[PDB]
């Protein structure tokens, strides 16, 4: 039940598809479907982009898709518009009843 | 669709000519109802709340003795007197001690002795009672639509919560898009709250029988005593000791909290903080589906492609739930969903999420279906791009029948004579069965009240033996049947 | 004491876990087992009395089990 | 619980009076009587069962007594 | 969930039924039980003879 | 005199530091670090998932 | 079942009935072995020392 | 030991060769033969016992075979 691992930075030209990886353990990410992706713009509170591995909130674009394989969960952005440039944090409800947040990644887009 | 993922889910199939069905709700259990042209619904009793409880008796579980006084009388002078002896907040006892010249009497014999100590309660357990008119059951009706959670909506799920009280026992849930459902509930029979006490001890509460509570061996106040200076039965929590007939001392008998916890075994624990919430009740209702309608029946079949966004999983009840998403042109459309054989020439399984529809394109819908025992194929979509999924169900039809008979017998054991109303649509056979069960349950409750499960098993074995060794065939079979029934009830009791 | 009237058999039983159900299901039977282990002398005499009282074989075993159950629980 | 296994039959009894001898001498019998009063139904059934299982009046009475005493204690 | 199951002082008092109480506030004094002695009268003289 | 203590019994306890761990079905049992310590009372059960 | 550098395909109930010290799949500290007594022997040969 | 309970009759067996199938197909028979040779005395007693508890040639032979097979097997 330790911090999930994500690449420090991710970049992708506009219109390309960009993928972020969240690697946990058999209890953090490989044990449960409590994988949620949070988008946080600088100076603002995080925004829940995905939950339940794949599901997204009502107001969240359809360009955000989540996948989970084994102990690794991935977030993929397709349109990759300029408004998609932010820090993306992965989280998971661990088997011990606690919450672990990934280190976070940054999309540069341009 | 909350009723999936719960092991006590139970399926009610069909309605009567009047479009109503009788269903018994329970707190741990959940009910899924399916009618021909009505959508599938999930009913669960979530909250039972008793309001305005009145205390009928306070029991002392940890007493205290403070001011001990004693008075002695010389032999042949009768019993002595203490003015504390007629004080009600003092516990007193009369005994005899050896008296003589050394003691200061002048006669040789037994001299009367009295000792008194002030009885003070340090901890008590409040037994409260609730009027049956003050029960307020809370039920949740969620249409088993297949729609996923919505963040923007004021209600994230489309489950609707309806409160049923004994006075307002008829209520209708308005399920947006599905018409309305009406519940004609009977709270007054769910629990007999005139024979129940809400027994709250220090930080924990139980729902207990009222005669049991009134027959406890502890000091008790009538419940209206704010001063608490007239405890009854004070001698059950003190001991008077006279060893060697020389002195007499009285001591308190120790905190009775653990003894009360042991005496509470077999009592259902109920929350009694921030309201009197009971999570053990059952409620009988008559469900009226006449104003309940399927959503999107006047839609066209989807022509696009479906992708599974949540791999097909098998629930504990022998059905399968899958989550599909739509990539087609028709914004709202009926999802083509069938459970067929490999060659697709026979329909083997039936849908539980009846009329699966795709309201929004980028919004997956998750479908519960009941595949047949063995191999079957879940076909989703139409030929161009159609996705076909295989599945194997590991049971057997005879096994499912045996499991269903076991479940029916178990609900009869729990909701004795009320199980007949769990799926009844009226009918002569149901009424005859319910009446016979009422008579036999009355007899059984008379002849087996206040008996443990081991005693029930012993009596069942004895009755079965008597039936087995019986000259008459009618009495032999009747006694063997009674023995088998009481053996089963003893095995299934005390849970 | 109050613990000797346990509220076990008073009806009122739902499909919800009651207080100390799993623990208290066999605790009395386990008590009887420990008592019979500690007091084998009484069990032999109870068996002899059951055998000498009652003619049928069923009768003797019924008496023996009843006596061995009452003995420890007579308190 | 501990209260279910009292120290009554230990054989360590002197002329000095014990802890709750006066109180507990009749507690068990009083509790059996109260139980029979509250739960009359089982008493009649036990009487019928004892009558059926006992060939002689001694067997019937002894069996009925044992059944009546066991039912409350067994709880 | 797990609960602590209250205090067992009173249940223990009920369990101790049939045990002779003794003293332990100072020295573990016992005021029960017998003692078997043999009397030696040989060297006993009447005081007022 | 000088009696040696033979056995200490607990008559009133208190539970604290309660913790829970869960596993998904068919994945064996969960693990709590507190299970190693013997002063933690622990129990294994199954809940619907 | 994978042992040192070799793997097998075994029956689940057979594997869960193996008489060896075990950890649960998510034990994650690695030190709380369950039936350790299967892998140790306690000897008190003359009732003199253990 | 783990070796005492092998993964033999579990119904998982394919056409692909199983672990230690070839060599281990006859280990039990070889061990039984070696044990019987090392301990001829017990086999005579087993034969005598099987003949004593007989009443049919088939019965005696089966009893002797089972005794000789389980005598080395029961540790
Ligand atoms: C009981 O004793 C206490 C000791 O402080 C005393 O204050 C109180 O007045 C006494 N009550 C009586 C003797 O009724
Ligand atoms: C238990 O909780 C207390 C806080 O009430 C804390 O001080 C203590 O360190 C905790 N101990 C353990 C073993 O968790």
Short mmCIF file of C-alpha atoms in Angstrom, two decimals, chain D residues 8-73:
data_model
loop_
_atom_site.label_atom_id
_atom_site.label_comp_id
_atom_site.label_asym_id
_atom_site.label_seq_id
_atom_site.Cartn_x
_atom_site.Cartn_y
_atom_site.Cartn_z
CA UNK D 8 -20.88 -25.63 43.71
CA UNK D 9 -19.86 -29.28 43.41
CA UNK D 10 -16.14 -28.96 44.06
CA UNK D 11 -16.04 -30.89 47.34
CA UNK D 12 -14.10 -28.20 49.23
CA UNK D 13 -17.02 -27.34 51.50
CA UNK D 14 -16.35 -26.74 55.21
CA UNK D 15 -18.79 -25.79 57.97
CA UNK D 16 -18.27 -22.13 57.04
CA UNK D 17 -20.96 -20.78 54.73
CA UNK D 18 -19.98 -20.25 51.11
CA UNK D 19 -20.16 -17.23 48.81
CA UNK D 20 -23.85 -17.16 47.86
CA UNK D 21 -25.10 -20.37 49.46
CA UNK D 22 -28.19 -18.74 50.95
CA UNK D 23 -29.14 -16.95 47.73
CA UNK D 24 -28.19 -19.70 45.29
CA UNK D 25 -29.62 -22.69 47.15
CA UNK D 26 -32.97 -22.38 45.34
CA UNK D 27 -32.12 -20.10 42.41
CA UNK D 28 -32.01 -22.93 39.86
CA UNK D 29 -35.31 -24.45 40.97
CA UNK D 30 -36.95 -21.02 41.09
CA UNK D 31 -35.74 -20.34 37.56
CA UNK D 32 -37.09 -23.70 36.34
CA UNK D 33 -40.46 -22.93 37.95
CA UNK D 34 -40.58 -19.47 36.38
CA UNK D 35 -39.69 -20.94 33.00
CA UNK D 36 -42.46 -23.53 33.24
CA UNK D 37 -44.93 -20.81 34.20
CA UNK D 38 -43.95 -18.55 31.31
CA UNK D 39 -43.71 -21.32 28.69
CA UNK D 40 -46.58 -23.70 29.52
CA UNK D 41 -46.73 -25.16 26.02
CA UNK D 42 -43.47 -27.07 26.26
CA UNK D 43 -44.47 -28.52 29.63
CA UNK D 44 -47.55 -30.27 28.24
CA UNK D 45 -45.60 -31.58 25.25
CA UNK D 46 -42.87 -32.87 27.57
CA UNK D 47 -45.51 -34.59 29.71
CA UNK D 48 -46.95 -36.29 26.62
CA UNK D 49 -43.49 -37.32 25.41
CA UNK D 50 -42.56 -38.74 28.82
CA UNK D 51 -45.84 -40.65 28.99
CA UNK D 52 -45.24 -42.09 25.51
CA UNK D 53 -41.59 -43.02 26.15
CA UNK D 54 -42.09 -44.52 29.61
CA UNK D 55 -43.68 -47.93 30.14
CA UNK D 56 -44.01 -47.44 33.91
CA UNK D 57 -45.06 -44.53 36.10
CA UNK D 58 -41.49 -44.28 37.42
CA UNK D 59 -40.03 -43.98 33.92
CA UNK D 60 -42.66 -41.44 32.85
CA UNK D 61 -42.20 -39.21 35.90
CA UNK D 62 -38.40 -39.36 35.80
CA UNK D 63 -38.30 -38.62 32.06
CA UNK D 64 -40.76 -35.74 32.42
CA UNK D 65 -38.73 -34.25 35.27
CA UNK D 66 -35.53 -34.52 33.26
CA UNK D 67 -37.09 -32.95 30.15
CA UNK D 68 -38.55 -30.08 32.17
CA UNK D 69 -35.27 -29.41 33.98
CA UNK D 70 -33.14 -29.64 30.82
CA UNK D 71 -35.19 -27.33 28.58
CA UNK D 72 -34.50 -24.07 30.49
CA UNK D 73 -30.94 -24.97 31.44
#
